[PDB]
């Protein structure tokens, strides 16, 4: 047989990238996965090169980043690429996730595929946050303070886990140095998790926009999808280029250009845009313990979808009620984000509380109810007795 | 387009000719850009300011 088939190493590449049978009808929404691998590489590469010039000590961290910005040849390109890359990493991840939601990609027999993806999402949030703390700006310090304190909510030992995590009395030199060590480690765990994601994808293959079987008409990954992936890879790079060279700080916060100060918290704190929806959910619960539990639940609830989707067909392509509600969910998520950027003031607090309700209700009430109703409608519209 | 068939004759362009062209492009393009750029900002650059200075 061909060498690409017989060689122990090449056959892996052949089965995953060259001869892999793809459903002839997949659309550009299926291009986000490769875009996610690309993002992972860009983050690792630019990160290692900057690590060569970075100092983790609390007295030097901020200045070492400035050193990367002012003295390292092409240093600012590395930092703006790494920083803006993290944002682009989340924009693409949400689209990857939303695509799965809309087409019922989370359904059997791809449950394992969906669950591993949830784990990756969590690991990515943890990674970006740790990286954020390495700049040691004003936002960095308080973020490191808030997130680590999240654990004090645990009864009895909670405050202990916290002083442990800090390695002292407060967010200090033992904190930022362990955060750097950890920021370097986690990306390699994501890589291993990405491999398990791909292994799970390979056993049943990709789904398609029609939601039905692809077994009757497949075309090779090689040529068709390699070249189609190239189209979005270049588009992705063009847009990232525009931010990196023309508007490098639009997705950041001015407060991070101010060194961290243990005694003063900024008058207006607005977290990273991709964390805003979660920040709003946290803020909407006037109880400490319940506040953190509901926030974590906002992520874990994604695990419930394979069971609450009562439909008999996969995906929202041929479903009027489901498409409509799908978009209520999308814009509700954006709203939550907008609320997160506002002050805890009158019309906003109640709006935040209702939006949070709607978010959870989609998974637990709307989907099961709507899918059941749609099942029946499909039946009585054709049976004549 | 018969303009293509004169240089490559019904065959694709080979890696060697691609790599060679890439090295040429890199230099020509950079000069074209630096030129246009400096001309667009004439009067604002240090070159321009250094002339208006005498010490």
């Amino acid at each position: 047989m061909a060498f690409r088939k017989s060689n122990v190493y090449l056959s892996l590449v052949n089965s995953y990238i060259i001869d892999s049978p793809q459903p002839s009808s997949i659309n550009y929404w299926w291009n986000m996965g490769s875009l996610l691998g690309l993002c992972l590489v860009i983050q690792i590469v630019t990160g290692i090169f900057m690590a060569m010039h970075y100092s983790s000590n609390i007295e030097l961290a901020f200045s070492s980043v400035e050193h990367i910005m002012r003295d390292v040849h092409n240093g600012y390109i590395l930092r703006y690429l790494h920083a803006n890359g993290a944002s682009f990493f989340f924009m693409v991840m949400f689209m990857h996730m939303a695509k799965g939601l809309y087409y019922g990609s989370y359904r059997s027999p791809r449950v394992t595929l969906w669950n591993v993806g949830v784990i990756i999402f969590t690991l990515t949030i943890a990674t970006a946050f740790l990286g954020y703390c390495c700049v040691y700006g004003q936002m960095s310090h308080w973020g490191a303070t808030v997130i680590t304190n999240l654990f004090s909510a645990i009864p009895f030992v909670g405050n202990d886990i916290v002083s442990w995590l800090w390695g002292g009395f407060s967010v200090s030199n033992p904190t930022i140095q362990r955060f750097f060590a950890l920021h370097y480690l986690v990306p390699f765990i994501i890589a291993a998790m990405v491999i398990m994601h791909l292994m799970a994808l390979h056993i049943h293959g990709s789904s398609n926009p029609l939601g039905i079987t692809g077994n009757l008409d497949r075309i090779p990954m090689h040529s068709y999808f390699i070249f189609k992936d190239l189209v979005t890879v270049f588009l992705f790079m063009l847009i990232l280029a525009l931010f990196v060279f023309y508007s490098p700080n639009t997705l950041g916060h001015p407060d991070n250009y101010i060194p961290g100060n243990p005694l003063v918290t900024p008058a207006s704190i607005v977290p990273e845009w991709y964390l805003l929806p979660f920040y709003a959910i946290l803020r909407s619960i006037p109880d400490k313990l319940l506040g953190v539990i509901t926030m974590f639940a906002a992520i874990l609830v994604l695990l419930v979808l394979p069971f609450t989707d009562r439909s008999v067909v996969r995906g929202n392509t041929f479903k009027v009620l489901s498409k409509f509600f799908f978009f209520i969910f999308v814009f509700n998520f954006v709203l939550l984000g907008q609320i997160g950027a506002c002050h805890v003031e009158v019309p906003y607090v109640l709006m935040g509380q209702i939006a949070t309700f709607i978010y959870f209700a989609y998974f637990l009430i709307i989907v099961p109810v709507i899918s059941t109703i749609e099942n029946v409608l499909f039946y009585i519209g054709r049976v004549n007795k | 387009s018969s303009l293509y068939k004169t240089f490559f004759k019904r065959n694709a362009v080979f890696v060697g000719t691609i790599f060679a062209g890439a090295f040429v492009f890199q230099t020509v393009f950079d000069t074209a850009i630096t030129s246009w750029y400096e001309n667009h900002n004439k009067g604002k650059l240090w070159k321009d300011v250094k002339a208006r200075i005498a010490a």
Binding site: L216, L335, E345 | -
Partner: protein, 93 residues
Amino acid sequence: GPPSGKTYMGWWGHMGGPKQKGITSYAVSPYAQKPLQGIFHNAVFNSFRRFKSQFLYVLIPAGIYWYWWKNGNEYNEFLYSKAGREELERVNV
């Protein structure tokens, strides 16, 4: 190698679909086709169609959320201006 678990996808020659018969496909080499330029005049009015059927599912939920946002915002602005400092003390605490 070790025995493998049953899946819903095979490989070329044993993909797992039902036995096909009666269907006949035809195709023409990309090399013999009109160079990419005919995607107009014939493929222009046909386009944009796959969004005239969808925009409602996107527009209505968008509209609903935009007005809700605009309403609450304008209310906030009023509450913190001079004119609304009275109603602010009412709804605040």
